[PDB]
Amino acid sequence: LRKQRFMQFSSLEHEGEYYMTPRDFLFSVMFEQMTSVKKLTKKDIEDTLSGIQTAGCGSTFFRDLGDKGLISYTEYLFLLTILTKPHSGFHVAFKMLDTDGNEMIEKREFFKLQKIISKQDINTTLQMRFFGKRGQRKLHYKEFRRFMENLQTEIQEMEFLQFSKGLSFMRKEDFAEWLLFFTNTENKDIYWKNVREKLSAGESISLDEFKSFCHFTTHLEDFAIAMQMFSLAHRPVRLAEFKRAVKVATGQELSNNILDTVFKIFDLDGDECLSHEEFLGVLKNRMHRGL
Amino acid sequence: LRKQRFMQFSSLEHEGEYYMTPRDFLFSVMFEQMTSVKKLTKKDIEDTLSGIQTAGCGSTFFRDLGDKGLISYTEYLFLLTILTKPHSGFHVAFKMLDTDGNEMIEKREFFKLQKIISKQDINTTLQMRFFGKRGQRKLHYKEFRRFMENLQTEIQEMEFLQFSKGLSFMRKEDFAEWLLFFTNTENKDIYWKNVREKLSAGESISLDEFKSFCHFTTHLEDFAIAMQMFSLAHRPVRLAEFKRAVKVATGQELSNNILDTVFKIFDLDGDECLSHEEFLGVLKNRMHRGL
């Protein structure tokens, strides 16, 4: 039923085929529900997606485009899978998209994705980004990896500026309210009791802290190993071992205020221990996209 | 009753005297109503406002500080007057704050503002910004002018990223919805009829367009001269003369999509003319701050 969200945030179309803006893509990432679909013929397509090299290929690429972009439903699901993918599966997905074995993804790979779309039953933005105007340009692994990390990082930045409310910093209330976004309302309100009572001022929460935290939340199942080890061993996880587990998982240290605030959040009982069960359950509810 | 908004968005205090963050200042600029006031003794004051030179003196200064700042009610009203001031009154207000005639504002000027506060009946952020830790540093006109324009420009940027929703561009719907913020609901909904019907796609609205437009909206009374000339002459103002009037007023050209979209907004009748009366009346309702 992921077609129905594409039905929701469509705003332009062509020959019965709904499209989106990059902005509608970003709203499908974040916003629940809001527009008017307008029609486009071929001259409109050229005037919109002309000049893709004008956009900078850094970490602001859809903000470099704004509305200048039309996204097929195949590209829509493709970018959603990029947003859901952990770091480890990069070269694996690249070689699965390397059917011809030529260390490359080609335009026939996207046409085979459209073959999948057809079995489930027009020049777009990423076609120009990775293959030029007609597909004559090629696509290697390094551009692919940089594109995936830039996309995820720009999503991190846009959520950061949403919940930080335009500042370069965050408070702990903003971090908790973002972190408890896809939680059920009763546990949310018990957590809000924990916010009102057990959370304090602390200090401002920076950008790289949130970036490392989002990098943590894309590696939850590999983090769950020592969790189930000391779960079936029934060792309630303290903060010092949690530091070691996070460092082994991500490869990067979180700051102590992150760990302190997380420990103030997920300790319902205040018993200096970890209820890892509800932690991991509502966390897997929380890091599921498409919603 | 401007004390009551200071009562609203206060979040820290000292000896019965409510303070704010820079973030609470920015929310008093934009947001209507939302926190918990917590107490601070002198060590808290030092630990908060230490290191003001760490913040960059460009156009992100409160975002460079975040929560690192405590704002007196005198400084609160002072910065609100800076946000309401047109460009022309700069040197005039500087010389009115130059009682000692020494081409400078000194700490006794702020103490005379506090004398005004007392007749209407503790080291703060701007004291360190303009005079150092104890007032021994001085304050000239150039820093004052740069501070006022950086403050106004950062407010422009924060509203831009609010209504643009994190993008580097705006649509015309965002520009209209920002522009019609302090309008009464019936005329607002007639304007929304005008949005749904007469507005089109156009193109993306950039940052410098919004900056020039806000610079226009701080010079409305000097813009009203030719308005009243062709009003008592009863010449309904067309767009071509409006270009000339805006260029004479601001000194900077607006782009044609700005003028086209404004002409699509304020032409209720569609009669290719200007209803300048409701324009200027609800515009003076719109550009009044403190709300």
Side-chain angles (χ1 to χ4, degrees):
Chain A
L1 295 175
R2 293 289 187 268
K3 185 176 174 63
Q4 295 181 357
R5 189 174 181 86
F6 193 80
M7 297 291 288
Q8 289 174 357
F9 286 166
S10 295
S11 65
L12 290 170
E13 70 94 18
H14 176 70
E15 302 176 354
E17 177 183 0
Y18 288 163
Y19 290 155
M20 286 186 181
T21 69
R23 180 174 177 169
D24 291 329
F25 174 74
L26 299 173
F27 289 166
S28 66
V29 171
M30 301 189 295
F31 291 173
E32 296 292 326
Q33 181 59 254
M34 295 184 286
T35 184
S36 65
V37 176
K38 293 185 281 187
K39 292 180 95 287
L40 302 178
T41 62
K42 304 300 290 183
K43 184 176 175 66
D44 299 332
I45 307 302
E46 289 183 353
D47 293 331
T48 302
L49 268 299
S50 178
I52 191 167
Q53 292 179 357
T54 63
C57 63
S59 67
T60 60
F61 183 75
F62 290 161
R63 295 179 290 177
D64 290 329
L65 289 174
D67 294 331
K68 294 193 289 184
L70 291 176
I71 300 166
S72 70
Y73 184 72
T74 300
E75 292 181 353
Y76 177 74
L77 295 180
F78 177 71
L79 295 174
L80 289 176
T81 55
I82 290 174
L83 286 177
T84 59
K85 191 185 293 295
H87 182 274
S88 65
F90 287 172
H91 185 269
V92 176
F94 183 73
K95 294 300 290 183
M96 183 58 206
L97 294 173
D98 195 6
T99 62
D100 50 355
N102 56 2
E103 300 293 325
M104 287 184 289
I105 300 170
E106 294 178 355
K107 186 60 67 70
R108 64 175 61 93
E109 302 293 328
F110 289 173
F111 188 74
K112 189 174 181 180
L113 295 173
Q114 295 178 357
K115 288 175 182 177
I116 296 167
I117 295 297
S118 67
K119 192 174 180 180
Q120 291 164 1
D121 295 331
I122 60 171
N123 194 356
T124 63
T125 304
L126 295 173
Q127 294 176 356
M128 295 181 72
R129 174 66 190 271
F130 288 161
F131 298 100
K133 279 79 175 176
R134 292 179 180 90
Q136 69 275 17
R137 190 183 179 273
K138 297 175 177 64
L139 180 62
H140 291 281
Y141 175 73
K142 301 298 293 296
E143 181 183 3
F144 180 68
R145 189 263 303 159
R146 287 189 296 269
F147 181 76
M148 293 186 290
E149 58 86 17
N150 286 321
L151 179 61
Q152 291 182 356
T153 309
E154 185 167 357
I155 293 298
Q156 290 169 355
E157 289 175 351
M158 195 172 186
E159 295 176 355
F160 185 80
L161 288 175
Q162 181 181 4
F163 286 90
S164 70
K165 292 181 180 180
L167 294 183
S168 297
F169 289 159
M170 280 188 174
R171 293 179 64 86
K172 293 184 180 181
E173 295 91 4
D174 294 330
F175 181 75
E177 190 174 2
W178 168 69
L179 182 57
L180 301 170
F181 186 75
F182 288 112
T183 64
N184 48 2
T185 62
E186 289 83 4
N187 292 316
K188 192 187 295 296
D189 290 328
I190 301 169
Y191 288 154
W192 282 113
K193 175 259 294 179
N194 301 322
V195 169
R196 288 182 292 271
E197 296 173 356
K198 292 186 286 186
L199 289 182
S200 297
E203 70 270 20
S204 66
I205 294 169
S206 68
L207 177 61
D208 289 328
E209 292 175 351
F210 180 76
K211 288 186 177 182
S212 297
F213 189 77
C214 291
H215 297 167
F216 175 76
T217 59
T218 59
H219 294 288
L220 298 175
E221 183 64 32
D222 294 332
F223 184 76
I225 298 167
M227 298 296 106
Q228 288 187 357
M229 288 299 292
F230 297 106
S231 172
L232 296 176
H234 294 85
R235 181 70 173 173
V237 176
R238 283 88 174 89
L239 189 63
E241 293 86 3
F242 186 75
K243 296 176 184 180
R244 185 178 185 271
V246 168
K247 180 63 177 67
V248 170
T250 65
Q252 289 296 320
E253 286 286 330
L254 293 176
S255 67
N256 293 315
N257 53 5
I258 297 169
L259 304 172
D260 180 76
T261 308
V262 166
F263 187 75
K264 286 185 177 181
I265 291 166
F266 290 106
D267 195 357
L268 289 174
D269 300 329
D271 56 357
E272 299 295 326
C273 294
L274 178 61
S275 296
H276 68 88
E277 296 86 4
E278 300 87 4
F279 171 77
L280 290 174
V282 188
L283 184 62
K284 289 173 95 289
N285 295 322
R286 174 65 177 83
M287 289 302 295
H288 189 276
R289 293 296 181 186
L291 281 79
Chain B
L1 295 175
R2 292 289 187 268
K3 185 176 174 63
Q4 295 181 357
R5 189 174 181 86
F6 193 80
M7 297 291 288
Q8 289 174 357
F9 287 166
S10 295
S11 65
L12 290 170
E13 70 94 18
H14 176 70
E15 302 176 354
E17 177 183 0
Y18 288 163
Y19 290 155
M20 286 186 181
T21 69
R23 180 174 177 169
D24 291 330
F25 174 74
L26 299 173
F27 289 166
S28 66
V29 171
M30 301 189 295
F31 291 173
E32 296 292 326
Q33 181 59 254
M34 295 184 286
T35 184
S36 65
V37 176
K38 293 185 281 187
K39 292 180 95 287
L40 302 178
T41 62
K42 304 300 290 183
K43 184 176 175 66
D44 299 332
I45 307 302
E46 289 183 353
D47 293 331
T48 302
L49 268 299
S50 178
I52 191 167
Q53 292 179 357
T54 63
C57 63
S59 67
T60 60
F61 183 75
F62 290 161
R63 296 179 290 177
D64 290 330
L65 289 174
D67 294 331
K68 294 193 289 184
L70 291 176
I71 300 166
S72 70
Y73 184 72
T74 300
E75 292 181 353
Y76 177 74
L77 295 180
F78 177 71
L79 295 174
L80 289 176
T81 55
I82 290 174
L83 286 177
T84 59
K85 191 185 293 295
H87 182 274
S88 65
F90 287 172
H91 185 269
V92 176
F94 183 73
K95 294 301 290 182
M96 183 58 206
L97 294 173
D98 195 6
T99 62
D100 50 355
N102 56 2
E103 300 293 325
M104 287 184 289
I105 300 170
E106 293 178 355
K107 186 60 67 70
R108 64 175 61 92
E109 302 293 327
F110 289 173
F111 188 74
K112 189 174 181 180
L113 295 173
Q114 295 178 357
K115 289 175 182 177
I116 296 167
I117 295 297
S118 67
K119 192 174 181 180
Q120 291 164 1
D121 295 331
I122 60 171
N123 194 356
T124 63
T125 304
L126 295 173
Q127 294 176 356
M128 295 181 72
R129 174 66 190 271
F130 288 161
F131 298 100
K133 279 79 175 176
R134 292 179 180 90
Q136 69 275 17
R137 190 183 179 273
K138 297 175 177 64
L139 180 62
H140 291 281
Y141 175 73
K142 301 298 293 296
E143 181 183 3
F144 180 68
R145 189 263 303 159
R146 287 188 296 269
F147 181 76
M148 293 186 290
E149 58 86 17
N150 286 321
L151 179 62
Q152 291 182 356
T153 309
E154 185 167 357
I155 293 298
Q156 290 169 355
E157 289 175 351
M158 195 172 186
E159 295 176 355
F160 185 80
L161 288 175
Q162 181 181 5
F163 286 90
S164 70
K165 292 181 180 180
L167 294 183
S168 297
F169 289 159
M170 280 188 174
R171 293 179 64 86
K172 293 184 180 181
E173 295 91 4
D174 294 330
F175 181 75
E177 190 174 2
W178 168 70
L179 182 57
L180 301 170
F181 186 75
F182 288 112
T183 64
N184 48 2
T185 62
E186 289 83 5
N187 292 316
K188 192 187 295 296
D189 290 328
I190 301 169
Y191 288 154
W192 282 113
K193 175 259 294 179
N194 301 322
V195 169
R196 288 182 291 271
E197 296 173 356
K198 292 185 286 186
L199 289 182
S200 297
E203 71 270 20
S204 66
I205 294 169
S206 68
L207 176 61
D208 289 328
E209 292 175 351
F210 180 76
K211 288 186 177 182
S212 297
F213 189 77
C214 291
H215 296 167
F216 175 76
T217 59
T218 59
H219 294 288
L220 298 175
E221 183 64 32
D222 294 332
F223 184 76
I225 298 167
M227 298 296 106
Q228 288 187 357
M229 288 299 292
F230 297 106
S231 172
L232 296 176
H234 294 85
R235 181 70 173 173
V237 176
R238 283 88 174 88
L239 189 63
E241 293 86 3
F242 186 75
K243 296 176 184 180
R244 185 177 185 271
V246 168
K247 180 63 177 67
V248 170
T250 65
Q252 289 296 320
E253 286 286 330
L254 293 176
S255 68
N256 293 316
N257 53 5
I258 297 169
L259 304 172
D260 180 76
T261 308
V262 166
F263 187 75
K264 286 185 177 181
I265 291 166
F266 290 106
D267 195 357
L268 289 174
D269 300 329
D271 56 357
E272 299 295 326
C273 294
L274 178 61
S275 296
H276 68 88
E277 296 86 4
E278 300 87 3
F279 171 77
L280 290 174
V282 189
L283 184 62
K284 289 173 95 289
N285 295 322
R286 174 65 177 83
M287 289 302 295
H288 189 276
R289 293 296 181 186
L291 281 79

